[PDB]
Amino acid sequence: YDIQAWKKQCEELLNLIFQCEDSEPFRQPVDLLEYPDYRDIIDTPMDFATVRETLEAGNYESPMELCKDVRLIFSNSKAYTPSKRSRIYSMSLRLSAFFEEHISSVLSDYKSALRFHKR
């Protein structure tokens, strides 16, 4: 029932993500010199360094907010991909499955802690 535990759990999950080879295209903002039409397709860029920085700055109030930004990394990859069989998109799918598998308990524990607090 620790309402604050999600933060360190998210820091650790981001550490695992940064170790994953599948995260390399998503660690920093998409390079506009390599993908010049990127902002024609994608309205809100997102990357894992921005998520980690937002978390470390104390600018997430809940793990749901962090989860929305991470999910935006994946939806941006799906929207930008020229093919659902592309290398970078395939990396995003694997990384999304890994993230979803790990974030589920973080969200559950946080929501349970909040409910216990307001009981």
Ligand X SMILES: O=C(O)c1ccc2ncsc2c1
Sequence-separated (6 or more) residues with CB below 8 Å from residue 111: none
Stretch that binds ligand X, among 7-15, 49-57, 73-81, 105-113 (CB under 6 A): 73-81
Binding segment for ligand X (CB under 6 A), chosen from 15-23, 45-53, 86-94, 104-112, is: 86-94
How far from 46 is each of 17, 105, 117, CA to CA, in Å? 15, 23, 32
Sign of CA dihedral 15, 79, 59, 109: negative
Cβ at position 86, least distance to ligand X in Å: 3
The yes or no reply on residue 46 touching ligand X (CB under 6 A) is no
- Residue from 86, 104, 105, 108 touching ligand X (CB under 6 A): that is 86
Piece in contact with ligand X (CB under 6 A), picked from 63-71, 84-92, 94-102, 110-118: 84-92
First-last CA distance in the chain: 12
Interface mask toward ligand X for 15-34; x: CB under 6 A? ----------x----x----
Contact present, 46 and 93 (Cβ < 8 Å): no
